[PDB]
Ligand SMILES: CCCN(c1nc(-c2nc(N)cc(N)n2)cs1)c1cc(-c2ccc(CCN3CCN(C)CC3)nc2)ccc1C
Ligand SMILES: CCCN(c1nc(-c2nc(N)cc(N)n2)cs1)c1cc(-c2ccc(CCN3CCN(C)CC3)nc2)ccc1C
Ligand SMILES: O=c1ccn([C@@H]2O[C@H](COP(=O)(O)OP(=O)(O)O)[C@@H](O)[C@H]2O)c(=O)[nH]1
């Protein structure tokens with residue numbers, strides 16, 4: 001039928017990859033689109049390019065932010081389109097869960113990088129123009145699931161996940177991304193250039209408590225949420 | 230009916246803008262898409278972004294080449310699409326003349342910048358990946374008109390046109406772009422990643438001689454060329 005498109009949003013190490021890999025196994029009608037950036041962290045040319053630009057960003061973010069953000073967002077659009085045209089053709093209640101969205105790319109990561117002076121105005125305006133247009137009408141979302149975790153939980157989970165590149169990330173940075181997520185998905189203060197987002201239903205799940213072995217209540221909320229869409 | 234799409238290709242200051250502004254006036258069925266880069270050289274946000282990135286390129290091409298090439302090519306695709314959907318709806322023999330193409334963006338300018346070490350491998354591979362995909366199937370060309378001028382003619386014409394930024398451009402650089410045009414459009418040695426280009430008819434016009442007041446023979450070749458398409 002028509003595939004339902006649901007973004008999973010949340011801070012770094014909130015548990016989106018964990019949650020998405022629980023969901024995919026629970027239904028034959030349920031597919032996931034993993035985040036390209038997450039995959040970058042034998043090799044496809046995307047993964048070669050992605051690792052290089054990721055490493056260079058850790059060296060010099062004010063040189064590479066624009067390049068990274070454009071490639072991260074292009075790679076997400078192509079992976080989302082491939083799943084939308086390659087999967088759930090024989091599903092009765094098809095749902096595709098996106099690990100983050102083109103909207104987190106812009107309004108969380110790229111925005112923060114502009115605010116941190118890692119992109120100058122021209123870079124940021126070119127990026128927004130490119131983004132507005134690269135999204136010329138489809139990946140429009142039926143709903144968003146916000147996995148809400150404290151910056152402290154995410155810091156603890158970065159430690160748990162043990163990526164060497166990430167161990168130095170300060171709480172301040174996580175606090176900044178946290179505040180952007182709260183503004184966009186909870187208080188809904190943040191104004192985007194995508195009218196329909198104002199209307200999109202948002203399910204907010206508290207995932208401060210470990211859920212890897214105790215996720216049934218979260219899944220019950222997803223199923224109830226999906227039934228309303 | 231179906232709009233015929235014809236690229237006008239050639240070196241810097243060969244006379245493409247002059248030739249295109251002669252053609253547009255000769256038929257109500259004939260429209261032109263001026264090159265965004267040419268327009269960048271009151272202001273739309275594209276022109277603000279375009280002038281900034283153009284000026285920065287003259288300062289530091291190895292920093293800005295990727296950003297410039299992506300924005301130059303996006304701006305061309307949107308301007309070409311706007312003309313294809315906004316013009317010649319009531320024409321019997323509609324023709325849209327493109328000032329250069331997405332193919333000159335890649336195989337002339339972006340290629341040269343990679344070869345001049347102004348883009349590193351990752352930048353060049355990201356750029357080619359983005360280009361391959363941003364062209365996901367339409368702007369496909371019915372034909373190409375190659376305005377062929379010697380590097381010396383183009384150097385003389387850069388002098389004639391009197392842009393201050395351009396007066397220092399060496400003959401060596403023009404010679405390099407010349408050789409890329411000869412490889413792509415005359416000898417057809419250059420292999421692109423667009424199969425159908427192998428098949429596209431090419432009209433080659435010698436424009437070493439001034440044509441501003443003496444263009445009737447060139448136009449007669451265009452009309453004969455168009456009749457075969
Ligand atoms: C695990 C985080 C990795 N990370 C980033 N990831 C993304 C990202 N974009 C997407 N579209 C999707 C996605 N999944 N991820 C953007 S960036 C990162 C940050 C810095 C860094 C370095 C320094 C700073 C702040 C510096 N500022 C200067 C002082 N003050 C004015 C404010 C702070 N911010 C981010 C570097 C590398 C990477 C990979
Ligand atoms: C009038 C030309 C402007 N110009 C350019 N224009 C484009 C361009 N791209 C499009 N997609 C469309 C389009 N219309 N134009 C790309 S670049 C330029 C060149 C240098 C420069 C500076 C230096 C070099 C060569 C340096 N190399 C080092 C030594 N050796 C290894 C080889 C030479 N090449 C180009 C700078 C600024 C601009 C704007
Ligand atoms: O309830 C949870 C959720 C996540 N994790 C761990 O926290 C880290 C980050 O999770 P994930 O990679 O899914 O976070 P994402 O960055 O995808 O949001 C990983 O080591 C997970 O195994 C955990 O122990 N309990």
Ligand SMILES: O=c1ccn([C@@H]2O[C@H](COP(=O)(O)OP(=O)(O)O)[C@@H](O)[C@H]2O)c(=O)[nH]1
Pocket residue numbers: 239240241242243244245246247248386387389390391436438439440441
């Ligand atoms: O037959 C010609 C063609 C061009 N020009 C001049 O040569 C310069 C470059 O022409 P144009 O801007 O059209 O070149 P493009 O860069 O568009 O190929 C300009 O000063 C033109 O007026 C000329 O005197 N005679």
Ligand code: NA
Pocket residue numbers: 023024025026027028029030031
């Ligand atoms: Na599944």
Ligand code: NA
Pocket residue numbers: 252253254255256257258259260
């Ligand atoms: Na006309």
